[PDB]
Amino acid sequence: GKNIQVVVRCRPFNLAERKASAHSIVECDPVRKEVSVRTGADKSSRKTYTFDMVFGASTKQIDVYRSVVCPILDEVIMGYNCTIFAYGQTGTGKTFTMEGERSPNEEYTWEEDPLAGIIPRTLHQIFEKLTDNGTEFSVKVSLLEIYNEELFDLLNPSSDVSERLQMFDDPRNKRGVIIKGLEEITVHNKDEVYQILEKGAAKRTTAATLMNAYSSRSHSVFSVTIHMKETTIDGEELVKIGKLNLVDLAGSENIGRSGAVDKRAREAGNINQSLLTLGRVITALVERTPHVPYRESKLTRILQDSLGGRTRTSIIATISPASLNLEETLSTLEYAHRAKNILNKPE
Ligand SMILES: Cc1ccc(C(=O)N(CCCN)[C@@H](c2oc3cc(Cl)ccc3c(=O)c2Cc2ccccc2)C(C)C)cc1
Ligand SMILES: Nc1ncnc2c1ncn2[C@@H]1O[C@H](COP(=O)(O)OP(=O)(O)O)[C@@H](O)[C@H]1O
Ligand SMILES: [Cl-]
Ligand SMILES: [Cl-]
Ligand SMILES: [Cl-]
Ligand SMILES: [Cl-]
Ligand SMILES: [Cl-]
């Protein structure tokens, strides 16, 4: 029940906002666990939302990682597949958290830097934690980009100038999907990752257009796979496998409020499907429904094994308080509410 979780993150509106003239009545409160926004004459109305964990504008980037990650890794560290994703409108800090951030000016080491997102924060933990554990481990890192009816591998530009790749299901496992030439190179050195990592930004960064939706319209999935072998004085050798998936998603503004002027139509479309496929797939899992349409979305199909195998999943929604975008906040809220169902606390 508990393992599936929903997190919504709220921060103070950007300083640059004034030119827009956007007004933010939006609020985020952790202690209450509920976020309410004034509907605004008829402005007394305030939206009531309930989540187990709700990030605030004050809240540190580190605090979120410990809350949702610092917990998943141990299960994942044990050798259980887990998925952490950020969905919602665009530029809500998902990439900064997901791809991390670097403090302005000359700065402490990246692990040292406060700014960095889950991947940098998530990545920093694995090497250090293992050292304390002392178990032998091998690291494989892979990155993916989602374009409709197309798949790309960030790590290697080799063998391809820049072409879409087909995906193949595997007979040995009915659930399993196999992609040829998929590039995951296990990390020889943890320090080494940045040089290897540096390529991912450049290749994705250069090709974003036509495209034209890159970052904003592309989920972009980065996955880390761990192989662990630990000994024992009583031991003996024990083998465990850990897979962690970290991803970024398109903006949540498109999704309809329930019984919205537009819900299916607003959320409707081929581009729409990955988000829509996720809600039914994600929504179905919470319910326990016999049939889950993981198949409909390519991203969903790949994710099935981690979800399908015993796993823990955390679902994240990001919002902006400012008046200037009406659509993004509602779509995130409907998606979060729809995806996760919780009774609303009444104060
Ligand atoms: C503390 C911190 C956090 C994020 C960044 C950052 O902005 N990155 C670029 C992507 C957009 N935020 C990071 C980053 O860059 C990548 C570049 C390529 Cl080509 C492929 C993958 C990455 C990637 O996963 C990250 C995430 C990251 C990891 C550790 C520290 C910081 C960020 C740093 C390695 C600079 C820098 C420092
Ligand atoms: N809490 C925050 N405080 C200050 N700036 C933030 C915060 N969250 C996000 N940002 C800013 O927003 C930008 C990141 O948005 P981005 O990573 O492009 O998201 P997306 O890829 O979803 O568009 C960065 O310039 C970062 O400085
Ligand atoms: Cl807020
Ligand atoms: Cl809020
Ligand atoms: Cl912890
Ligand atoms: Cl722990
Ligand atoms: Cl198939």
The CATH number of whichever domain residue 129 belongs to comes to: 3.40.850.10
> Which tokens belong to 272?
């729409």
**What residue spans of the chain are helical by DSSP H?**
61-64, 70-78, 94-99, 118-133, 193-206, 264-267, 273-287, 298-308, 326-339
Q: Tokens 């990155």 — which residue?
A: 143
**Protein residue whose Cα sits closest to atom 16 of ligand 2:** 91
Probe target for ligand 1 pocket from 197, 220, 224, 247, with the most ligand atoms within 8 Å of CB: 197
In one letter, which amino acid is 84?
I
Cα 242 to middle of ligand 5, angstroms: 17
B/e letters for 207-239, b = 16+ CB within 10 Å, e = fewer, are beeeeebbbebbbbbbbbbbbbebeeeeeeeee
Q: Tokens 């917990």 — which residue?
A: 71
Q: ∠ CA 194-198-199 to the nearest 5 degrees?
A: 135
How many CB atoms lie under 10 A from the CB of residue 32?
13
Residue count of the chain, please give it.
347
Q: How many Å is the maximal CA-CA distance in the chain?
A: 74
Domain count, the chain: 1
C-alpha span between 22 and 271 (Å, rounded): 28
CA 164 to chain centroid, in Å, comes to 23
Structural domain for 325, as ranges: 1-347
